[model samples]
Target chain A: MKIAIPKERRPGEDRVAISPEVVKKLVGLGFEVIVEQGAGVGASITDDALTAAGATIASTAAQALSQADVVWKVQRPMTAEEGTDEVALIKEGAVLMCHLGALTNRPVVEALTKRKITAYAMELMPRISRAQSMDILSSQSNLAGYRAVIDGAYEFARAFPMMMTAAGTVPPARVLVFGVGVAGLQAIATAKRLGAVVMATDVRAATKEQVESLGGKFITVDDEATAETAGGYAKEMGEEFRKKQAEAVLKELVKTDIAITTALIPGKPAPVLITEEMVTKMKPGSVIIDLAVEAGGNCPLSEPGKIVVKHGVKIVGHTNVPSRVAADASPLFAKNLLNFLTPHVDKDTKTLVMKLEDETVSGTCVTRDGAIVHPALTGQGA
Target chain B: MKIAIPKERRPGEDRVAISPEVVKKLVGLGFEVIVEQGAGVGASITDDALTAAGATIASTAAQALSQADVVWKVQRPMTAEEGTDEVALIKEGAVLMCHLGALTNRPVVEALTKRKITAYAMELMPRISRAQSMDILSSQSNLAGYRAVIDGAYEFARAFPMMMTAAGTVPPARVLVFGVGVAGLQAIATAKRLGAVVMATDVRAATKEQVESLGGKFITVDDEAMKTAETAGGYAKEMGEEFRKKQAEAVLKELVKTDIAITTALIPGKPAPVLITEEMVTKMKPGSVIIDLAVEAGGNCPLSEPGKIVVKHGVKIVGHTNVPSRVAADASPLFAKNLLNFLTPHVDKKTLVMKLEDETVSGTCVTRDGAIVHP
Candidate 1:
């Protein structure tokens, strides 16, 4: 079996699914790897390094995809120049591994079914303890969190820590993180390590313990009971449930020197947590970074894809946070892909086999046999 | 004695010599304080705060200086506007407390002589144990050193600390400091606190231990040094032309590996030495920052431009004056303490005596009793 790795076509998406380190591992498993030339260039990987790890370099992406039985990629399928796409170039019945966004991306799903491809969505992998190493969402969100604080600190003009010198003493900077998800927790940790006093909040009540454990104070607007599904996802809270803490949240915002917003609602535009009045009331020389900018902004004053200084407060709109740290992000993502493929391995014959009956395998197999197989699109009950 | 504080007349100089915290201290010392309207605006001090601290606000600069026996200022004298000069408004024989670059500023010295004013140049204060608290140069350079790292780190794109994440390990950034003066020492201390691996160099061989004591590695081109820093008699011999050229070449070679460079070498009135060549910057990595603190004269880096941050070959060169303005809120209080330290020793209760017998006081009094009279 041969696995093909093509260069990512999305602009500013500088990641590869199979790195040189993983290529050596896959080659040891009795599998041949074919990589397109310059596929690892963005992530600082040279073709000579890939070839030294037992991988053959193909001149064109089409040549690499047509000869392989499996394909690995970082993002969804995108078209190269002249409207020719990787999905259209691949032969039918080949296995595809990527984040398919199973519910929302209709056209990509439709194309997969018409091509008769066996597609597995890595995002739909059940949050089981055994599958912890292969969790892509957790891996990508962690990187985004680290980069967000770095960007915020770079734009801030003052010192982070309180220092007493022969000159005078400078007080420590105050940082606030909205939303206590995976990304928010890391932001709080990164900020605290940089000597800033950190405070964070979420709609879920149980997140207070996680925030406090990380040396951060937790503030909230939600007094009602918060619920989480078996899959470890926080259920959405109603609009009326959030307005109760607006006054307290605004009071905290005024005293905040730096604020990072990471709240997002999946499949919908993000909720606006900061009102227009809040931006004006914040102190001059303060900074706020909206991490939910690509899905619209969490603050009303935040302009997506633009750095603005409104009312002397700098608002940084970061559409994609992970790509800002592309060099480190690619290696971790490649490791996650290799871990996901380890489960379906047929050890003795060195040939692939599909066990659709397994809960982990069935949960991610979105399309098979020229039809939508996952329960979400097929009207078949989970 | 009544002490008057006028607003600084220079453009973009945001620091005030006195703060409200020291305004109350000055009032308690049998000194009536008069501050010009909006004198403390640039440094985030409010006129209301000054009034609350027992200072009376003047409507004009002339009104503030006419009735005062002493004046305190941060920079040299200049006009508030095109023709509204503050020097002409002040009454003759009033004592002047400001950084009058006395040796280089001939016009100001002659102006003080013509008016028979007793001028005490703050920049000329002799460095001694008793005058340490009143040392203006030490106080200002400390604030400038702290500001240099904040500006350089703001321009650097990577993390300063070594980070080991689930993805990979990121090495700590390398910082290079030229000159081991007051500013250079503080820059090394500030960058070390920010988690950067700092390397520093100085012409004075005695400064190696100072750099190493601050957790920074000392890198220098001179294999042997002559007398100035080695002996107390000021006997350091200047090196030959051939040695200077060879040292400059070695300095350029060391700059290639630096991720952030801050140059703080300033001769009294001479042009700054060019330690970083254009060829050296071409080989440095992209996103390297070079902050030139001596750009008012020339600069250690050839690419540095005064009052602006220019990018060349992906290296950011920050050369600007009044770095303390970026942290003016804190800078004002330190400067106020230095001023208070200088004034308290000469005044006793009701009468203020001019103690020309004391070496520390005589060394700073540039022009007194109708002529320059320190001798």
Candidate 2:
């Protein structure tokens, strides 16, 4: 079966679904891999480099989409100048494997399912102990957390570390990471590496250990029972708990030189942690990066998918923070996809079989039989 | 006797000529300080603070200038709306002190001379050992050097130091400093504190030890008689024409290798000499940063503009002016102290008595008794 990797068309998305290493792995499995020219350009991968991995380079996206029996991608597809044409050209009934393993965007589900496509969401994979290798969210969020600090530093006007000069002493910048998730923890670590006095807070009590382990101090307002969710993901807190968290965050906001917000309530808008009133009190030339901007953001002043520098502060509401480091994000994402496909491939045939009967496979299958088959949206959408 | 500090109206110039610290010193010496309201606001100063230091606040610039026998300022004064109201407002034959005392802003000298104002140029202060405390240029440039590092780091897309993470390791960023002047040494020291392996170069061999003391390796650096005879380094070249060409080639190699390069070579009354060419920028890393300090005179890099942060051949070239303006609170106090020291010898317990015979006074005065007398 022919597999195609098209150039990612989303703004700020630089990651390709497969790196050269992953392309070689798929080709070694006897899959005929066809990639559109410039598909990996954003990630600094040249067409010539892809061919070296034993993948055929198609001259155009149309040609790549037409012949492919399976498709892979980094961002959710559609809406570019050639996006509609490219979507229509995807061979009907081809299996699509990508980061779209959930019903995060029903429009994409509607787009693919109506075309009689087989769609698997990279995120819908069950969190069984064996599924750790294919956990795309963990891999991608890890990169997002690291990139957040890099982007924040670009906007912050002062030096991160304090310096004692012949003239006078400059105090170290204060960095406050709100949310102790994977990305938040990484932001703390990166800030610490740059010599910032890093402090963090999270709704999850267990996150305290993670934050401290990264050499960051944890700030909180004492609510132990509201912390962990049964599924091992961070739980959103009650209104009373949120009020205290905001108070705790506000106290730090006044002194914070760089603030990074990474909190997200699964399937809901990101909670507002820093209100407009609170931002006004921040020191001039201070910077804030809202990693949850795509999800309505945790800061009221942040605009989605844009950089806002006004009122003497820089607020970077980055939507695809991980995509900024495409070279690294691509390789890690590809490994997750490859591992998800590992067991499905036949031992001798070197071809993947449709294993809908398998629990993990069905758990991630969002679309099949010209309809949205995911249980969460089965009755809601066509 | 009153010393007037009018609100600085020039763009991007926020530093005040006299801070509250100097106001206290002047008051201790029995001088009255009449400050224009909001004069020190840019430096995070409150009118209450100045008054507490024994100063009076004037509601308008004219009110402050009308009563003062001496005026101190940061930039050259001029008209905005009622600007003529200002020129005539200053007490005639008043003692004026400011950076504009230099002949660069000829209009200032013309305006002051026509009014018979006795103006002393802060830039013209003789570099005597005792004058070190009153050296505005050195004190301000020292602050500029520190600010340059902060500004450059903000534009750089990566961390300065090499970091080891669970996934991988990022190598430390490299820094190259050109010129071992006040600004260059501070830039090197700031870069080193941030974990950048810094290297510097200059025409003076004396600077090599200063660079080394700051944990920086000095390079392409030169000669013997050139050291003492050419010690007076500013914007003008006292070295032979042969020195720059030989120095340029060695500088380019280091420029291409370092992630950050700060150019601080300056010349008075001349366009800054270009040390790095357009072709050299192409050889640098795509996200590399360059800080051109000489843009106010003439930039040391071909691509640097007067007040723009532009990108070329994957390099970001920043030429922001008055870097010290960003930290007005600190620059104002340092500058105030320098300006205060400049007036000390000429002033006694009750008032300032201008002395024409003093070499320091003669060297600095641009205009006296209505004629251009200093020359």
DockQ per candidate: 0.21, 0.13
lDDT digits (tens) for residues B127-211 of candidate 1: 6767877877877787678778777766665556666554445567689898778889888987886678998877677778899
Give the per-residue lDDT of model 1 (tens digit) for A1-382.
9899999877777777877888998887788999999887666566888999999999999998996788888887853332656688666988888877778666676676778888889888788877766767776777677667777766665556665655456677789998778789878877776678998888777889999998898876655664565666654577665576567788788988889998886567887878777888887668898888877888888887788888778899966566665545666677777877876778679877767777767878888868888777664222
lDDT of 1 at B317: 87
Overall lDDT per candidate, in order of appearance:
0.77, 0.77
- What's the TM for model 2? 0.79
Counted clashes in each candidate structure: 2, 9
lDDT value for model 1: 0.77
Model 2, range B1-375, lDDT digits (tens) per residue?
788899887888888888777899888877889999989877767788899988999999989999688899887677334355355666888988888745666766777777888888888888676677777788778767867777776666445656544323445678998877888987897778666899988766667789999899887435563365334533335565577676767776777778889999876566676767787788886568899988787888989998899888768899998777766756777777777887877887466887778877888888888888655
Reported per model, the fraction of native interface contacts reproduced equals 0.12, 0.02
